[PDB]
Amino acid sequence: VQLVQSGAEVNKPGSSVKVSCQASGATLNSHAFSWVRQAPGQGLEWMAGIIPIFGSSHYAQKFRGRVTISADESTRTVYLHLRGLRSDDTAVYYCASNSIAGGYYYDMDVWGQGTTVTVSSASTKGPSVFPLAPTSGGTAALGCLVKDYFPEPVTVSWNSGALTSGVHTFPAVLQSSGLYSLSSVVTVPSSSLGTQTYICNVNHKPSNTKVDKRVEPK
């Protein structure tokens, strides 16, 4: 049994977002579905639920009037509609199910992978990529700085994915400016610096931008 949710959403304050959750089963009537969110480093918060077989839906007081949960049996998809978005609605939203056949129906043993919803006044901005030029115990460290971009995410690979051992791409930091920055570093044998070419491949789909930055020794 699997639940697959839709991709990351990015919204301006006051706007609305719709997140989907597609079930792997043949029907939705065999389960009860819940939507739960979790902000960075904070706790789980149950928002709403729906039990298709009974056409019943429930909502946490905190979200009444702003949230709507719907179900489409023809496509076995459940939806979460959130209106009047606030910056503090920024979080990972999960859909979860429980097999039945409201407390007697809601439970969450199967969880979707989650959908990130970012609410900010910031506007889309491609990243500026800078090389972090190359040492301890015969090993050197080199990398790429991916500065001031919005919104998440940014993926980084090295040498088109051919270089993976020793690679460490760090989670981005959300700056006081509302923009993100992250870095990727690779530890390589110092002797390789004189031959092996090193290029970091930065991809920021939100801006349809990709940068391949060559990193050479100073």
């Binding site: 789980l44 918060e45 429930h58 007081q61 409201g102 969450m108 972090l132 500065k147 870095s183």
Partner: protein, 213 residues
């Protein structure tokens, strides 16, 4: 301000037993079944107890649960290092007609060997300086437990502005990583003899330094 109340954290050594309480009222725990969820850093929650004391198929028998009146408890006997995670209780609340979660409790397994952070500090790149900007990059990895304090110095003076530090993130090897950035003007970078990133972990510090030269 969760409707259900849990202790912020519980700790014990391997082999011992830990218990996590979850208090509520008649409308929720008192008249409805309680479930417990386990969540490892950066992973989706997993149901470990439902119907107050039932273990979902597959969950080790060292996990147990109970409910008496308006409060519930999660127990973990023979505590293992692999049990270090956040745990949440949840139940239906009849007065609100909604599911409610406790605020979560962090379970720490004591006595584990500590791992000092590996620190790499990069100076501003020539390209960035040519763009009239300057960022020092401090990358911290392979430390455990996942908690560090990052301080920056210009020469020997504490830097209190322009710093952005991430919270620790769990690595694939179960150790932690974090990064810190120091934004400066090209003139500030070139004006000092050096800048340093100091990473304090479990009482000891690892410091890296870079210089305009």
């Amino acid at each position: 301000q969760s409707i259900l109340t849990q202790p912020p954290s519980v700790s014990a050594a391997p082999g011992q037993k830990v218990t996590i309480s979850c208090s509520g009222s008649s409308s929720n725990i008192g008249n409805n079944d309680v479930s417990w969820y386990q969540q490892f850093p950066g992973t989706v929650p997993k149901l470990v107890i439902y119907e107050n004391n039932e273990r979902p198929s597959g969950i080790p028998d060292r996990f147990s649960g109970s409910k008496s009146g308006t409060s519930a408890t999660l127990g973990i006997t023979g505590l293992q290092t692999g049990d270090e995670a956040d745990y949440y209780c949840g139940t239906w609340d009849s007065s609100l007609s909604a599911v409610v979660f406790g605020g979560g409790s962090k379970v720490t397994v004591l006595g584990q060997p500590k791992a000092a952070p590996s620190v790499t500090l990069f100076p501003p790149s020539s390209e960035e300086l040519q763009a009239n900007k300057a960022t020092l990059v401090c990358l911290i990895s392979d430390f455990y437990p996942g908690a560090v304090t990052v301080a920056w110095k210009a020469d020997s003076s504490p830097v209190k502005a322009g710093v952005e530090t991430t919270t620790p993130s769990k690595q694939s090897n179960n150790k932690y990583a974090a990064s810190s950035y120091l934004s400066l003007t090209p003139e500030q970078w070139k004006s000092h003899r050096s800048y340093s990133c100091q990473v304090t972990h479990e009482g000891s510090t690892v410091e890296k330094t870079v210089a305009p030269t």
